[PDB]
Structure 1
């Protein structure tokens, strides 16, 4: 009673939408979703509460492994036991496993405490000090991201021996508190009227209507008659479509576009012809229209919630029978589809093989794919998508024949399944099949594609769907998946077209983890304070000097309400990172229009690794930055899987609200512009501005360390030259390029990509060529190694070209202005030269790299 009511108010506050608002809709689809998903998520919670202690570590602290390890050398490690000040430093091999390190620490504890211990190494796990990260399992130490990170930066790993009883105490502490196919007549509707229409009185109003199965028309579009512009237009007319009622596929959507003609677009509205319970819709429909920015088939099938101001179209769906009509059950479909004809010549089998291994077709090529559909299934199962695209979705007999093959189709690789999630495959059985083949995604692969899977929810026609159930089950089985699923949904609650769907998924998730709900509430409280703090800084920076606004920001942060809200939270950018003590004196803000905040933290428990920063931004939109950075990270994983480490810096970036988000601070780094300012009385001051970068590296890396820094610069420079070229990152200048004290170069500010439109050429800067060449004018040995790194990076990306294409195609659902159409996708197709052979693509890259070298030399002339 009192706990339920409190939890309900806590979910309302967390998701940014009162749960009573779901109840007020009196929507049976909303009610069934809420009841079935609450049950599903509570069942997941009960399974979790009884997990074994090692399984609970897999849930709460999933392993962070090196990409090359997924599916020798000496090392110094500092190990302590929980709640003990005392620690032990000892030598291990990078090939040693956590258990050997643990047995070693237990022998030391037994010698110091003078007693032969009862404890076996099997009863413990290794925590990374002051982090929600653990080392466990039969993996050598160098396979762990944390150990790998220490090895490269020279730092000593600091670990804590945590007993099973302590992990079990965590699990316990975090518990949830106790017949259609006979109807041959053409499809028709009555277009009754319009309400709250706003247009120029000199013009006339028209309603264009179309039937779609995804993006493809099921028949030609039909238009109403022209009627004089007014607030309440009255048509009362029959719109007849060239398709029989029996031929409407299950996922058929009726799409409307209201406009004014002398073309002046006004509004659009879509609806599914069948409901969530498979019933063919009849009766009057009031469609609350969305404003046009003509027909929008990809647009949401739910009405505009702003019923007070929105244009409304009133339609009538006729009663096609005196009894309700449902879409036929799978048994009936399989029965009709089971019947057909299966041959073809040795020459035409070569023609089919040619086009299936080849991707638009000519009409005759389509007919052969369809005729040879059984052979597509048995000998080319990976060509399923091609066959689905040749299926006549406007003929129920062909759809039955297609569904018959699909229902016995072998499971496809993850790559093939991602393509099938596109809106180009709108059928529900196709969608279910795609999810079935995605079930084999590892948590690491799932995390890599989570952003695209969340965007795909915007294409879904109904609330209760296989994709939502899949995402929820995986989120509830892995705390990190759960964390990012929550933030990707929460960051879009200000978007009315997704607020209901996203709000309902977050509620179900919360029912599955009351403890995680409170952990996320703590994060939301810090974000609420940062927004109030940022508003103060925006106002104050216009009235006074920078030192004054900064002192005022500090005084504001030092208030008890701010010190409480801003400290002791898991970072929204990374739940493994603990943001412990806010270091007010180190906090500041940037001089740009939105005055973003620079927030520093420290943790005595984590030591040096506890010194972390976040950038809070309110006013800018970080969605494209997050996507670009996720793509750069993916490049890093694919390169590392080929044994290529280009020493990349894919720092965290996460939208959290309406034009609000965080960016991970990379410490010990500066922009190229700041370094090239060549200030006097500094360790880097230069005789020639071209020496500035190398002198800065020299001051940071004395003696023998310079060699390693130049190499880190070269590797990262090759990675970023390739990444920015492939992704078409433009507006590159000295203040959006950074260098770490390690020598690593990295890019920032990804507000423009995919050419935005101009084809971005490969960029080679003389300043960077100068450092790669160790400061020498001529150094082809070092320069050409760098070219090899670029070529190797580029050829790896090309081999995974389809993965980038499939992911970017799914991202079109995000509604990013620079990722809206096929033209934007064509940019990636050209940058990766996907229509060519590897030798032709490498020849093309070489011409592009040489064109960038001749461009660079115009600066070398001076």
Structure 2
């Protein structure tokens, strides 16, 4: 890598992944590899990727987040599905009025164990943004405060009969009444600062004329990404895994190390969160409320998706290569046709692990109490988009199912 010099007897290498099929290439324009700088940096996460900086034909750089060890083919395919997804959104008039567009980024699977991912320039990590905005005083309230777990959580495991750090969740679901867990969750969420993103944006926008726009745009982006992910892109919504574009306010999906189903089949980290609608996002639309812009845009999006299902359903047959795919696609088509998201998540659990001593209590958690969770009332199948979305909302933001979620998947942000 150090000594790349453009030379004859060597076919010039064009920058990986610079083709998008919206038209004939004009293949001369593409920037081609021209040596690349030092100062590779790591990204500080498990399976440490690093960040190459390729400079090419044009002296403008092109950071590409080299990453290995994973069968990135998964990421490639899922990104392609967002591509078709974004198409289907655009081709409608109702949705396009509001110019909804998921943001895709080039995924270029280089081999079985390597593939570049174009760094999105001028963007920051959602938890990076959050932590960045918080006052240096309260910064200690996440780094280390008397409630040593970010808010009391790891300690509260002990209070819920869970002794060790890993797997102790496997016990709490036994004696977790709808109250003490919920009350605890209220508390821990409360301690976390409020008006976070609001502060970030207020810092961002020039004049209050702009805050409303940027807020609408952030809300729309996060909303659309969330719903599209519920279609398929489930799982692993670590606050590292949502990027926010400092420049323009978009929320861009990031990692897909677990696609649909891959979230919850993987037992040691059981997950019952379909969306990410944790507190700071609610508090953003402060005077309004969830079921404000976000729920409406949910309704619109989901109504769009189901218009011609085959375009997206009968597109994720790329899993040609029992068969796990032959059934995860079935769950997908079930949800698109309309199933109580509680039901689909319950089925996901039922297939997920029937050998654990919790799947009774896991299923019970998923369903939610009939008294105070609007998900449990709906029929298992045959749902109208209004109902589908609303049920899914409650399933996402339910304090109970939220509160007992995995550490790391920081449910308070």
Q: Deviations over 1:584-636 (max 9, x none)?
A: 25532334454433122457958xxx443112223222011111111122111
Question: Are the counterparts in 1 of residues 36 and 53 from structure 2 also a CA contact under 8 Å?
Answer: yes
Match of 1:823 among 327, 346, 366: 327
Aligned pairs for 1:441-452 within 5 A: none
Secondary structure of 1:812's counterpart equals coil
Q: Which residue of 2 aligns with 1:690?
A: 194
CA distance in 2 between partners of 1:616 and 1:573 (Å):
13
Cα 1:579–1:593 change in 2 (3 A) is farther
- Residue 294 (structure 2) pairs with residue 786 (structure 1): yes
- Residue 282 (structure 2) pairs with residue 769 (structure 1): yes
Cα RMSD (Å) of the superposition?
3.8
Q: Which residue of 1 aligns with 2:4?
A: 562
Cα 1:698–1:735 change in 2 (3 A) is same
Q: Deviations over 1:376-401 (max 9, x none)?
A: xxxxxxxxxxxxxxxxxxxxxxxxxx
| Structure 1 unmatched runs, 5+ | 1-528, 530-556
CA distance in 1 between partners of 2:135 and 2:387 (Å):
48
- Residue 51 (structure 2) pairs with residue 598 (structure 1): yes
Match of 2:130 among 668, 676, 683: 676
Match of 2:40 among 587, 601, 605: 587
Question: Are the counterparts in 2 of residues 675 and 692 from structure 1 also a CA contact under 8 Å?
Answer: no
**Structure with a larger share of its residues in helix:** 1
Q: Deviations over 1:177-221 (max 9, x none)?
A: xxxxxxxxxxxxxxxxxxxxxxxxxxxxxxxxxxxxxxxxxxxxx
- Residue 104 (structure 2) pairs with residue 650 (structure 1): yes
Aligned pairs for 1:324-339 within 5 A: none
Q: Which residue of 2 aligns with 1:81?
A: none
Give 1:716 shift.
Answer: 0.8
CA distance in 2 between partners of 1:588 and 1:622 (Å):
20
Bigger Cα Rg = 1
CA distance in 2 between partners of 1:762 and 1:677 (Å):
21
Question: Are the counterparts in 2 of residues 668 and 740 from structure 1 also a CA contact under 8 Å?
Answer: yes
Secondary structure of 1:637's counterpart equals helix
Match of 1:807 among 280, 295, 315: 315
- Residue 353 (structure 2) pairs with residue 844 (structure 1): no
Question: Are the counterparts in 2 of residues 812 and 821 from structure 1 also a CA contact under 8 Å?
Answer: yes
Cα 1:761–1:596 change in 2 (3 A) is closer
Q: Deviations over 1:140-197 (max 9, x none)?
A: xxxxxxxxxxxxxxxxxxxxxxxxxxxxxxxxxxxxxxxxxxxxxxxxxxxxxxxxxx
Give 1:650 shift.
Answer: 0.9
CA distance in 2 between partners of 1:580 and 1:567 (Å):
11
Cα 1:680–1:764 change in 2 (3 A) is closer
- Residue 255 (structure 2) pairs with residue 749 (structure 1): yes
Cα 1:838–1:797 change in 2 (3 A) is farther
Aligned pairs for 1:296-307 within 5 A: none
Q: Which residue of 1 aligns with 2:156?
A: none
Aligned pairs for 1:189-204 within 5 A: none
Secondary structure of 2:387's counterpart equals helix
Give 1:764 shift.
Answer: 1.8
Match of 2:212 among 707, 729, 733: 707
Question: Are the counterparts in 2 of residues 669 and 739 from structure 1 also a CA contact under 8 Å?
Answer: yes
CA distance in 2 between partners of 1:857 and 1:686 (Å):
28
Cα 1:803–1:689 change in 2 (3 A) is same
Aligned pairs for 1:475-486 within 5 A: none
Cα 1:570–1:770 change in 2 (3 A) is farther
Q: Deviations over 1:85-105 (max 9, x none)?
A: xxxxxxxxxxxxxxxxxxxxx
Cα 1:657–1:605 change in 2 (3 A) is closer
Question: Are the counterparts in 2 of residues 737 and 748 from structure 1 also a CA contact under 8 Å?
Answer: yes
CA distance in 2 between partners of 1:765 and 1:567 (Å):
50
CA distance in 2 between partners of 1:861 and 1:659 (Å):
34
CA distance in 2 between partners of 1:588 and 1:799 (Å):
45
Cα 1:786–1:577 change in 2 (3 A) is farther
Give 1:745 shift.
Answer: 1.0
Secondary structure of 1:655's counterpart equals strand
- Residue 234 (structure 2) pairs with residue 722 (structure 1): no
CA distance in 2 between partners of 1:658 and 1:858 (Å):
36
Cα 1:623–1:857 change in 2 (3 A) is closer
The count of residues paired between Structure 1 and Structure 2 equals: 291
Q: Which residue of 1 aligns with 2:89?
A: 639
Match of 2:18 among 574, 589, 593: 574
Give the TM-score of the pair, scaled to structure 2: 0.60
Cα 1:760–1:628 change in 2 (3 A) is farther
Question: Are the counterparts in 1 of residues 130 and 200 from structure 2 also a CA contact under 8 Å?
Answer: no
Match of 2:78 among 628, 631, 642: 628
Give 1:795 shift.
Answer: 1.3
Aligned pairs for 1:220-231 within 5 A: none
Q: Deviations over 1:341-400 (max 9, x none)?
A: xxxxxxxxxxxxxxxxxxxxxxxxxxxxxxxxxxxxxxxxxxxxxxxxxxxxxxxxxxxx
Give 1:731 shift.
Answer: 2.0
Question: Are the counterparts in 2 of residues 801 and 834 from structure 1 also a CA contact under 8 Å?
Answer: no
**Structure with a larger share of its residues in strand:** 1
